[PDB]
Amino acid sequence: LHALLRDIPAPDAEAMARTQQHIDGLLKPPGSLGRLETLAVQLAGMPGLNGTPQVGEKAVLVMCADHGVWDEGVAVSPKIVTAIQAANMTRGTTGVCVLAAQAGAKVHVIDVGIDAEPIPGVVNMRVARGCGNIAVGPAMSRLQAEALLLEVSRYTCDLAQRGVTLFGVGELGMANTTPAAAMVSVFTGSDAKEVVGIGANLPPSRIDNKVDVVRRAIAINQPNPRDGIDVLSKVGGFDLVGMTGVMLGAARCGLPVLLDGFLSYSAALAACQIAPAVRPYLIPSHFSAEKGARIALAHLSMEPYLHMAMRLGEGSGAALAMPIVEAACAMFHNMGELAAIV
Amino acid sequence: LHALLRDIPAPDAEAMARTQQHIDGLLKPPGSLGRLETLAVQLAGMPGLNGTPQVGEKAVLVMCADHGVWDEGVAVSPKIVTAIQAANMTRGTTGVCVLAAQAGAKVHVIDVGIDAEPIPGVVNMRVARGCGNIAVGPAMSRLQAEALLLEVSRYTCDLAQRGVTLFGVGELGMANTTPAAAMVSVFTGSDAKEVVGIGANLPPSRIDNKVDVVRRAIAINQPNPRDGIDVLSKVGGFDLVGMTGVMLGAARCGLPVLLDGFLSYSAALAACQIAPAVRPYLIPSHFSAEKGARIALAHLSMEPYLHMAMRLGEGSGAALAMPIVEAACAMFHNMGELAAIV
C-alpha cells in the first residue's frame, strides 16, 4: 500500500498550459465558459488522459455493505433492503442504473460486506457479513481496511486498462449515513449535531438518538484525525472504505473520479488525508441535501456543479454529472478558433 | 396578440397528481431524488407533453440583433462581431452549437435585427438594421415590439408541430447586456449599479460609463414597469424581444422552455409581466456570472440547477441543461417500483 500511495502521479503542468492556451483561443470571449474551462484544464493535467481532455468508457462503482450500527436504530429501512437493492442493481431498475444508462456509463456492483448470501452477478469482495457496530467498538481492524483499500484500488485501475477513463463512485448500505457523519465530525472537527442528517427519511423524532450514537462511536473509538486509515477502520464501514479505494485507485491510474453525495464526501475526506496527491483527480458532481454537506464540502474546498437537492446515493449524482465532463471535452475539441476576430 | 395571451393553457393538475403518485412509488426513498422529481412533475403538467414527462426533438433558438447603444462605448467588441458570430452559428463552430450537438439539439439562428447584409442560412425576421440607441430614445416602437412577439411566437409553436417538445432560448448581439441591465433595473426596482455587469469582458475602468448609460436610458424613456411591452420597446432590443416571444410561443403551445443566462432572465421578467401564465413553462438552467444575476433570479423566484460561472450567452447554458431534463424523464419512465419493500 505504501508503494501504491508513493506512485500516484502529480498533474502534468505542461499539458495543462497547452490546454489553457488552446481554450483561450476559442471562438468566445476569454474565460466566458467559466468552470467548464477550468474542468477541461483539470482533465488535461491527468496523465491517464494522454495530455488532452477526453472521455472514453465510463463506469460507476457501487460499493455495498451492511453496518452493525443499524442495531442502534439509526435507519428506518430493514437491514435486508441493502441486499434487495444490490440485486436490483443487476436488473437495471435502480436510480443509479437509469441515470448511468442515460449517460452511457456501465455500473459495477461490488459487495464488500453485505449481511446476506452472495448475490449472483455482483462482484464478490466481501470482508465480512456486515462491519462491527461502531457504537461499541471499531467497524473493522486496520489490517482489514488496508487490505480492502488495496483490493479495490487494483480493481479500479485494472478497469482503466479496458478503456475506462472516467469513474463515478457510489454506495449502498442501510444506516451508512451514521458512520459517514462520524467521519465528517472527526475530520472537520465539527460537532456531531452539526453534521448528522436525516439520511434516508429518518423521522425528526429519531435524530437525537442518531446524534448520540455518533458521539458514542467517537468517544469509544478515539479515532486519530491525522490518520485516515485509523478513522476509516474505527468509525467507518466497508462501503466507505471501498469508495476511498476507488479514489486512490483512479488517482494512481492518473484518471478522474466523479464524487457523488454525502457518503462520498466522507470517503474523499479520508482519501485526501491518506494521500494529498489524490485531490487533483477528484471532481465534484452535486450538492447533497444531507445536513453535513456544506461542512464536508468546505473542508474539501469543493463547489459542486449541480444543485438538485438530491439525497439518494448509489452514485446517482456522479452519473448525472458525466454529461458535464463530456461537454467540457466537446467544447475543447469542437469549437472553432478566434484566429480563424480580436 | 391578445388572443395569443388569452389562449395560454393552465397546467394540468390531474396529470401532475398522477405523476407525483407514480414517482413516490419508485424504487427509492420518497423524495430522495429532490429537484429531479419536482422537474418531472412540472413537465407532466404541460399540456403539450401529453400528460407525461417526455422529451422528443430539442431546439435552441438564437435571436440575433445589433443595438444602437453600442455607440455609447458599452461593449469592447466591434459591432461586426454580431454578424460574424451569426455566420459561425451556421458552421457549427460556436459554443452553443457544440453544446447543442452534444445534447442532440438543433440550433435555429434567427436574425431579428443584425446591422449587416443578410446572412445565408440564417432565418430572416429582421425588423431593422439594429435597434435605436436607448440612451437617447426608445429601441423601437410599441408596434414593432408587438409584431415581433407575434411573429416569433408563431414560429416557435409551428416547430412544435414538427416534433420539437423542448426549447432553449439564446441570443447574439454586441452590447446587449446593457439593455438587459436596464430592463432588470426597471422590473426589479433595483439601482443600475447593482445590476450592471462586465458583459463580455468589459474593462473595470469602463463600468462607470455603462452604469451611467443605463440610468440615462431609463430617465429619458420613462418605461412603465407594469407594462412589459412598454419596457421592452423602450429600453430593450430586438434580440431581447425575440427571446420573450419564444417564451410566449412555447407556453401557448403548452411546452417547456429552458432559460439561459442574464439576457434570458431579463426576457423572462418581461414575459411574466406580460402574461403570468407563462411562468409554469419556464425552466432555469444555470446561474450566470453576470453581476445582476442573483437579483433577476430572485424576482423570478428561480433557483438554477447548474453553477458553472458561465457568461457566454448564445443559449449555451440552456443546451447544457437539456440532459438534466432528459434524466428526469428517464427516472420517471425507467425506474422500477417499490411494490415490485415498504
Ligand SMILES: Nc1ncc2c(ncn2[C@H]2O[C@H](COP(=O)(O)O)[C@@H](O)[C@H]2O)n1
Ligand atoms: N430503498 C432504498 N433505501 C435507501 C437507499 C436506496 N438507495 C440508496 N439509499 C441510501 O440510503 C442509505 C443511507 O441512509 P440511512 O443512513 O438513513 O440508512 C444508503 O443505502 C444510501 O445508499 N434505496
Ligand SMILES: Nc1ncc2c(ncn2[C@H]2O[C@H](COP(=O)(O)O)[C@@H](O)[C@H]2O)n1
Ligand atoms: N465573440 C463573442 N463575443 C461576445 C459573445 C459571443 N457569444 C456570445 N456573446 C455574448 O456577449 C454579448 C453581450 O456582452 P456585451 O454587452 O459586453 O457586448 C452578446 O453577444 C452575448 O451573446 N462571442
Ligand SMILES: O=C(O)c1cccnc1
Ligand atoms: O448524499 C447522499 O449520497 C445521501 C444522502 C442521504 C441518504 N443517502 C445518500
Ligand SMILES: O=C(O)c1cccnc1
Ligand atoms: O449570462 C449570459 O448569458 C451572458 C453574460 C455576459 C455576456 N454574455 C452573456
